[PDB]
């Protein structure tokens, strides 16, 4: 009946909290989408602005602008759910079943008109959000696509990573778009750097986070942040951004540009699935977990 | 007409999902017993103490549904061979937990993937579950014809797909299965769920799965082409493979999302309906496929009435015997002597009299006179012969109740006719018998058959190897089942080399120091990489001149049922590389009481000598 496992927390430009969730146990294995105009009233279901029930669990989601929400479904579908004119409803635009297994990762491209999905079917697809079709289908990997992260400013560049131990730098301008960026353990999470469009960070299943420059695939700086897998990495909105890394070790850390630890939060009792920094207060960081918690952190800056 | 199932990775409501699947036409659903993404922790706090239920309840379905309709699926995050110590430890506990939950439910099958070269700890944890408690479920190893790493799109700029042939490299998924089942000690509860891709591999890659325990064949929706009308269809190469799997009676599984306006199931049913109809041999053997039987010993034992009934209902073999006598009667008696010469015709091992009735029809069409004798040692069959001698044959046939080697005949014979052959020709001791009948044969008399030859071909079949392994009995040598031939309608197997002649006997043998013992060395060129488990034996016989009978597959006498191939197993299976020669040695041995075979492989590796001194198997004289 209800979805206890919170999968995604996403703050839009004004400061309204987005909430993706799934029931990964019990009689029903369905999912839900929630909007909270009052972030402190989360995850209380009756203290929300809008909500919707989905037929399958929410593995991933992204803000397609300020009204739209792109969803990676267990059913093998990419879904677009847009807020109504009043922002008190969430309605389906498309539910496209083009992937043959759990869609687990999603990222909207720079123009906001294209997006890239990464499924357990090993494929990577590029979508036209307006045309509601798959522009290109890519079987470049050998195992499950763990993470797909679209470039901040380039609409044809993005990073993907997989259980086949590869990190592919994509640029759809080339006839062979993918390119392996080496340097170990399996890549689990990708985060593009906001200022250096040629720098990015990635987390492996051994709790280690590594700082990687596309240019030279050598000298690369890294640190052991967590004890278990690194499920996510999100950079702060600051001009000089802080990196928040979440993990299966039920902890959250905030690190500087030299990877030193500035914050550590053990408030979570289950897996930490998402982190979103406040558009209003840049030292306020929100983390949803599998324990149904929403925990609002005050990062010491 | 086709047992088919639906593979799912998303089941939000169990009975809703099953009802939709059943409406589609699927006889079963393969689904996860725990939520695919619900990763669990067993070692460290606080995720170790995760409250609430761990999966949906068993109450949601009747015990019957859980026993016949649900096929479990191992969670994709469970990786017992991960290079991360914590992931191995965690996936060990999670794997036993999932396997035990499927046993709790009485699931008829459970799926486990083979997607990497090393599955050593996966095998150890499955082997440990197999040895714990009471379950009996089948384990299905989902392994592809082509590894995903070798079928990827050539789109990685600095890591291109190779465009050269890698013979052994293309058969890598077979070795993933071979190592896995060797590690699990060839468990009868471990079978293959073979995954077919969009583009089929080379034939040799496909042929690596011959003789393998394939219980399911997985067809993903993306392998289906679209026709003019818009429905999913398959390439003519994919259809040939489906026809091969229909012979093995595998369970077809449809996986992945829908990309066509069940249509996939309808196509399978359509293909199944249009397969070539089963011939007389194919309909007779329906049920006997890969079933191990003891070879008959009609000399040592007395054949049951129904055994003779079955041997009689072989029109082809008797029509061939009719003509062999028909051509001999013309050759021995010229038309001028048509009523001056009556030929002494002696059947040796007459049974209930089917050769006696062939000799009557052969005397009518050849228009010659014959004096028939029906020699039979089985006193029970002799009751059948004497009731027919009185009621129908009359003075024509003289029924003699004796063993051909101890019978003192009234007068010498013109033709001796016998059916003393087994699936390996001389394995029923025909040489010994007809030898002891040469004294009562005229100095120019004909023997029908006049010659017979045994043949052998090396085979691969881990299924027949496992079937022989299951023949271990108490109060005997624990490996005696590997040192005796079996009569078997070989079906799930692979013939590694063309049959070659082994031992030949000719009758009469007017040479002294005759000796029926033999020693033959065969050299079998092998063109594929494989695993040898034994040798199929067949035979050929010359009844008279061009009239012949054969069970050698290439020259098989059409529509003949009296014989199925023999199988001579070997204790330890032998790896054979492409280009290697399998060398086999065979011996026919004897003392005054028994006759037996002994055999050994001398190349590419030696085996022990099988059945030394008939310690495991003899044929009584
Ligand atoms: C030394 C001695 N002296 C007298 N008779 C002897 C022997 C040894 C065996 N026998 C007979 C031979 C006979 O074997 C057959 C009869 C029929 C037919 F009757 F159907 C068959 F089709 C087939 C066989 C055997 N090969 C497969 C087909 C069986 O009756 C035995 O008792």
Which DSSP string do the residues of A175-192 spell out, in sequence order?
A: SS-B-B----PPEEEEEE
State phi, psi for B141 to the nearest 5 degrees: -90, 110
B380 in a domain, yes or no? yes
Residue B298 forms part of a structural domain: no
The count of domains in chain B is: 3
The widest CA-to-CA distance across chain B, in whole angstroms, is: 109
Which of A117, A142, A146, A172 would best serve as a mutation to test chain B binding (most B beta carbons within 10 A)?
A: A142
Judged by CB atoms closer than 8 Å, whether chains meet at B220 and A100 is answered as yes
Domain harbouring B271, CATH code: 3.20.20.150
**Which positions in chain B touch A26 (Cβ < 8 Å)?**
52-53, 56
Treating both helix axes as pointing N-terminal to C-terminal, what angle do B236-247 and B263-273 enclose, rounded to 10 degrees?
70
Shared domain for B500 and B578, answered yes or no, is yes
- What is the least distance, in Å, from the CA of A9 to any CA of chain B? 18
Smallest Cβ–Cβ distance between B12 and the set A30, A121, A270 belongs to A30
| Closest approach atom of ligand 1 to CA B381 | 30
CA torsion angle for A115, A119, A123, A128 (degrees, to 10)?
A: -20
Q: Two tokens at B13?
A: 């409501």
The chain A residue lying nearest B60, using CA atoms, is A27
Cα of B289 from ligand 1 centre, angstroms = 25
Q: Which residue has the tokens 């006049």?
A: B450
CB contact under 8 A, B156 and A100: no
**Strand order through the sheet with A296-298:** A272-277, A284-289, A296-298
Which residues from chain A sit within 8 angstroms of residue B221, using beta carbons? 100
Token digits for B328? 């001999």
Structure tokens at A33: 């989408």
Nearest to B281 by CA among B612, B556, B6: B556
* CA B350 to ligand 1 center in whole angstroms: 6
Say whether both B431 and B502 belong to one domain: no
Q: Residue A140 and residue B56: Cβ atoms within 8 Å? A: no
- Are A76 and B257 within 8 A, CB to CB? yes
Q: Which residue of B has its CA nearest to A164?
A: B149
Residue B483 lies in a domain: yes
Tokens of B242: 């489906």
Give the separation between CA A85 and CA A63, rounded to whole angstroms: 16
Q: Work out the angle at residue A108's Cα, subtended by the Cα atoms of residues A102 and A111, and round it to the nearest 5 degrees.
A: 155
Give the pairing type, strands B28-30 and B4-7. Answer: parallel
Q: Using the CB atoms, write b or e for A90-118: b if 16+ within 10 Å.
A: beeeebbbbbbbbbbbbbbbeeeebbbbb
CATH of the domain at B478: 2.70.160.11
User: Domain with B439 in it: what CATH number?
Assistant: 3.40.50.150
Please state, in angstroms and rounded to a whole number, the distance separating the CA atoms of residues B219 and B6: 10
Q: Are residues B421 and B443 in the same domain?
A: yes
Helix locations, B187-262, DSSP H: 203-207, 236-247
Q: B151 and B98 in one domain?
A: yes
Separation of CA B428 and ligand 1 centre (Å): 9
Peptide bond into B459 cis (omega under 30): no
Q: Is B176 within a domain?
A: yes
- Between the alpha carbon of residue A236 and those of residues A2, A149, A232, A244, the distances in Å are 31, 16, 13, 7
Find the angle CA(B12)-CA(B17)-CA(B19) to the nearest 5 degrees: 155
Statement to judge: residues B268 and B320 lie in one domain = no
Neighbouring C-beta atoms of residue A259, cutoff 10 Å: 19
- Tell me which chain B residues have a C-beta less than 8 angstroms from the C-beta of A56: 10, 12
Inspect the interface and report whether the beta carbons of B52 and A25 lie closer than 8 Å: yes
Distance CA A39, CA B595 (A): 91
Q: Answer whether residue B166 is part of any domain.
A: yes
Q: Which residues in chain A touch residue B47, judged by CB atoms under 8 angstroms apart?
A: 248, 250, 269-271
Residue by residue, DSSP assigns A99-153 as SSS-EEEEEE-TTSSEEEEEETTS-EEEEETTTTEEEEEE---SS-EEEEEE-SS
Asked whether the beta carbons of B434 and B490 are under 8 A apart, the reply is no
Q: Which residues pair with B112 in a beta bridge?
A: B141
Q: Are B495 and B457 in contact (CB under 8 A)?
A: yes
**Burial degree of A8 (CB within 10 A; 0-12, 13-18, 19+):** buried
In chain A, what is the greatest distance between 2 CA atoms, to the nearest angstrom?
52
Beta strands in B526-565 (DSSP E): 530-544, 547-550
Task: For residue B457, list its beta bridge partners.
Answer: B536
Domain with B263 in it: 4-293
Last residue of one domain, picked from the residues B261, B293, B325:
B293
Report the residue of chain B nearest A5, measured CA to CA.
Answer: B38
The rounded Å distance from CA B512 to ligand 1 centre is 26
Closest by CA position to B549, among listed B536, B537, B561: B561
Structural contact between residues A174 and A128, judged by C-beta atoms closer than 8 angstroms: no
User: Alpha helices of B372-421 — where are they, by DSSP H?
Assistant: 379-388
Q: Which member of B92, B195, B212, B419 is catalytic?
A: B419
> Of A215, A288, A225, nearest to A61 (Cα)?
A288
Q: If you write DSSP's letter for every residue of B509-526 in order, what string do you get?
A: ---SS----EEEEEEEE-
* DSSP assignment string, B95-156: HHHHHHHHHHTT-SEEEEE--SS--HHHHHHHHHHHTSSS---EEEEEEESS-HHHH--S-B
Give the distance (Å) from ligand 1 centre to CA of residue A41.
Answer: 93
b/e B108-137 (16+ beta carbons within 10 angstroms → b):
bbbbbbbbbeebebbbebbeebbeeeebeb
Q: Is position B312 annotated as part of the catalytic site?
A: no
Tell me which residue of A185, A48, A163 sits closest to A105, measured CA to CA.
A163
Closest by CA to A187, choosing from A149, A218, A150, A157, is A149
Which protein residues are within 6 Å of ligand 1, measured from CB?
B 298-299, 303, 308, 311-312, 349, 351-352, 354, 375-378, 381, 403-405, 419-421, 428, 433, 562
A29 vs B35, B148, B153: nearest CB: B35
* Closest-CA residue of chain B to A270: B47
Assigned domain for B300 exists: no
Distance between CA atoms of B336 and B333, rounded to whole angstroms? Answer: 8
**Please, which residues have CB within 8 angstroms of residue B313's CB and are 6 or more apart in sequence?**
B561
Determine, for residues A100 and B157 on separate chains, whether the beta-carbon distance falls below 8 Å: no
- Asked whether residue B425 falls in the same domain as residue B517, the answer is no
Q: Which of B264, B293, B322 is the last residue of a domain?
A: B293
Let me know if B432 is a catalytic residue. Answer: no
Quote the DSSP letter at residue B612.
G
Distance of CA B2 to the CA centre of its chain: 21
Q: Which residues contact A124 (CB under 8 A, 6 or more apart)?
A: A116, A117, A118, A137, A138, A139, A140, A141, A145, A148, A160
Same structural domain, B418 and B456: no
Three-state SS at B283 = helix
Distances in Å between the Cα of B282 and the Cα atoms of A279, A300, B213 are: 75, 80, 21
Q: What is the three-class DSSP state of B90?
A: helix
CB pairs under 8 A between A and B: 137
Regarding whether B348 and B264 lie in a shared domain, the answer is no
CB-CB under 8 Å, B152 with A139:
yes
Q: Pocket of ligand 1, candidates B295, B296, B298, B408: which has the most ligand atoms within 8 Å of its Cβ, to mutate?
A: B298
Q: Which residues pair with A36 in a beta bridge?
A: A17
Q: Based on the domain organization, do B101 and B38 belong to the same domain?
A: yes
Say if residue B458 is in the same domain as residue B432.
no
How far apart are the C-alpha atoms of B615 and B612, rounded to whole Å? 6
Query: How many other C-beta atoms lie within 10 A of the C-beta of residue B615?
Result: 13
Contact A271 B47 (CB under 8 A): yes
Q: Can you tell me the distance from the alpha carbon of A77 to that of A71, in angstroms, rounded to the nearest whole number?
A: 8
Instruction: Give A4's contacts in chain B (Cβ within 8 Å).
Output: 52
Cα(A227)–Cα(B138) distance, integer angstroms: 37
Residue B163, token pair as written in the block: 């465009």
> Which of chain A's residues have a Cβ under 8 Å away from the Cβ of B115?
143
Sign, Cα dihedral of B506, B508, B512, B514: positive
B255/A100 Cβ within 8 A: yes
Shared domain check, B264 and B373: no
Cα-based distances in Å from B554 to A170, B538, B560: 56, 11, 14
Give strand pairing partners of A232: A246
Closest partner residue to A179 (CB to CB) among B83, B156, B256 is B156
Q: In this structure, what token pair is assigned to residue A123?
A: 């494929």
- Same domain, yes or no, for B260 and B326? no
Contacts of B157 in chain A (CB under 8 A): 174, 176-179
In a domain, B266, yes or no: yes
Taking CA atoms only, the protein residue closest to ligand 1 atom 18 is B351
Of B259, B293, B327, which residue constitutes the final position of a domain?
A: B293
Q: Rounded to 5 degrees, what angle do the CA atoms A125, A131, A133 make?
A: 30
């Amino acid at each position: 009946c209800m979805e206890r496992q919170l999968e995604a927390a996403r703050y839009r430009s004004d400061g309204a909290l987005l909430l993706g969730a799934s029931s990964l146990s019990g009689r029903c294995w369905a999912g839900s989408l929630w909007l909270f105009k009052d972030p402190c009233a989360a995850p209380n279901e009756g203290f929300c602005s809008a909500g919707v029930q989905t037929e399958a669990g929410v593995a991933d989601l992204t803000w397609v602008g300020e009204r739209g929400i792109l969803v990676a479904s267990d059913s093998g579908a990419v879904e677009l759910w847009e807020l109504d004119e009043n922002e008190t409803l969430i309605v389906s635009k498309f539910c496209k079943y083009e992937h043959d297994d759990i869609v687990s990762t999603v990222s909207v491209l720079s123009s906001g008109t294209q997006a890239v999905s990464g499924s357990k079917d090993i494929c990577i697809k590029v979508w036209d959000l307006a045309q509601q079709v798959v522009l290109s289908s890519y079987r470049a990997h050998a195992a499950q696509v763990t993470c797909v992260a679209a470039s901040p400013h380039k609409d044809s560049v993005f990073l993907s990573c997989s259980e086949d131990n590869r990190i592919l730098l994509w640029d759809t301008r080339c006839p062979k778009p993918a390119s392996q960026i080496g340097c170990g353990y399996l890549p689990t999470s990708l985060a593009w750097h906001p200022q250096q469009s040629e720098v990015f960070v990635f987390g492996d299943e051994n709790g280690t986070v590594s700082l990687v420059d596309t240019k030279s695939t050598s000298c690369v700086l890294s640190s052991a942040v967590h004890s278990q897998c690194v499920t996510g990495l999100v950079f702060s909105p600051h001009s000089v951004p802080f990196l928040a890394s979440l993990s299966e070790d039920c902890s959250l850390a905030v690190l500087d540009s030299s990877l030193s630890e500035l914050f550590r939060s053990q408030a979570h009792r289950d897996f930490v699935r998402d982190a979103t920094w406040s558009p209003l207060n840049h030292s306020l960081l929100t983390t949803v977990g599998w324990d149904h918690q929403v925990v609002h952190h005050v990062v010491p800056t | 007409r086709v047992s088919s199932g639906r593979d799912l990775n998303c089941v939000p409501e169990i009975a809703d999902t099953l009802g939709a699947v059943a409406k589609q036409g699927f006889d079963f659903l393969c689904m996860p017993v725990f939520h695919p993404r619900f990763k669990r922790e067993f070692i460290q706090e606080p995720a170790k103490n995760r409250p609430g239920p761990q999966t949906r309840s068993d109450l949601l379905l009747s015990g019957r549904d859980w026993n016949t309709l649900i096929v479990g699926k191992l969670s994709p995050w469970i990786r017992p061979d991960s290079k991360v110590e914590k992931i191995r430890r965690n996936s060990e506990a999670a794997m036993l937990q999932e396997l035990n939950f499927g046993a709790y439910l009485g699931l008829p099958a459970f799926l486990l993937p083979l997607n990497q070269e090393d599955n050593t700890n996966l095998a150890r944890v499955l082997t440990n579950h197999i040895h714990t408690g009471h379950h009996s479920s089948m384990f299905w190893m989902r392994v592809p014809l082509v590894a995903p790493e070798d079928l990827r799109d050539d789109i990685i700029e600095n890591a291109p797909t190779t465009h050269t042939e890698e013979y052994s490299g293309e058969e890598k998924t077979w070795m993933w299965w071979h190592n896995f089942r060797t590690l699990c000690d060839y468990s009868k509860r471990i079978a293959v769920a073979l995954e077919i891709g969009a583009d089929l591999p080379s034939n040799h890659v496909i042929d690596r799965w011959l003789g393998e325990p394939i219980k399911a064949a997985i067809l993903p929706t993306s392998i289906f082409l679209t026709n003019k009308k818009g429905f999913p269809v398959l390439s003519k190469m994919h259809q040939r493979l489906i026809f091969r799997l229909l012979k093995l009676e595998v369970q077809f599984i449809i996986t992945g999302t829908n990309h066509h306006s069940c249509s996939y199931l309808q196509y399978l049913e359509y293909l199944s309906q249009n397969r070539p109809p089963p011939n007389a041999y194919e309909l007779f053997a329906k049920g006997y496929e890969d079933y191990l039987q003891s070879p008959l010993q009609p000399l040592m034992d007395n054949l049951e009435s129904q055994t003779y009934e079955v041997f009689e209902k072989d029109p082809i073999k008797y029509s061939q015997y009719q003509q062999a006598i028909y051509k001999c009667l013309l050759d021995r008696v010229p038309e001028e002597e048509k009523d001056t010469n009556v030929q002494v015709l002696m059947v040796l091992g007459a049974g209930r009299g089917p050769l006696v009735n062939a000799s009557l029809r052969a005397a009518k069409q050849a228009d010659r006179r014959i004096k028939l004798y029906a020699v039979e040692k089985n006193p029970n069959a002799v009751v059948t012969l004497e009731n027919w001698q009185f009621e129908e044959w009359g003075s024509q046939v003289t029924v003699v109740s004796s063993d051909t080697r101890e019978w003192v005949a009234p007068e010498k014979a013109d033709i001796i006719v016998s059916e003393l052959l087994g699936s390996f020709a001389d394995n029923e001791l025909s040489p010994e018998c007809l030898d002891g009948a040469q004294h009562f044969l005229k100095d120019d008399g004909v023997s029908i058959p006049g010659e017979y030859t045994s043949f052998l071909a090396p085979i691969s079949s881990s299924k027949l190897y496992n079937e022989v392994r299951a023949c271990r009995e108490k109060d005997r040598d624990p490996e005696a089942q590997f040192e005796m031939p079996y009569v078997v309608r070989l079906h799930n197997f692979h013939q590694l080399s063309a049959p070659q002649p082994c031992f030949t006997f000719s009758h009469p043998n007017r040479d002294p120091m005759i000796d029926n013992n033999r020693y033959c060395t065969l050299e079998f060129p092998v063109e594929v990489n494989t695993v040898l488990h034994g040798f199929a034996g067949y035979f050929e016989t010359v009844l008279y001149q061009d009239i012949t009978l054969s069970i050698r597959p290439e020259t098989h006498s059409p529509g003949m049922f009296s014989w199925f191939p023999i199988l001579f197993p070997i204790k330890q299976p032998i790896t054979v590389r492409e280009g290697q020669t399998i060398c086999v040695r065979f011996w026919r041995c004897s003392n005054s009481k028994k006759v037996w075979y002994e055999w050994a492989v001398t190349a590419p590796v030696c085996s022990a000598i099988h059945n030394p001194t008939g310690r495991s198997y003899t044929i009584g004289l």
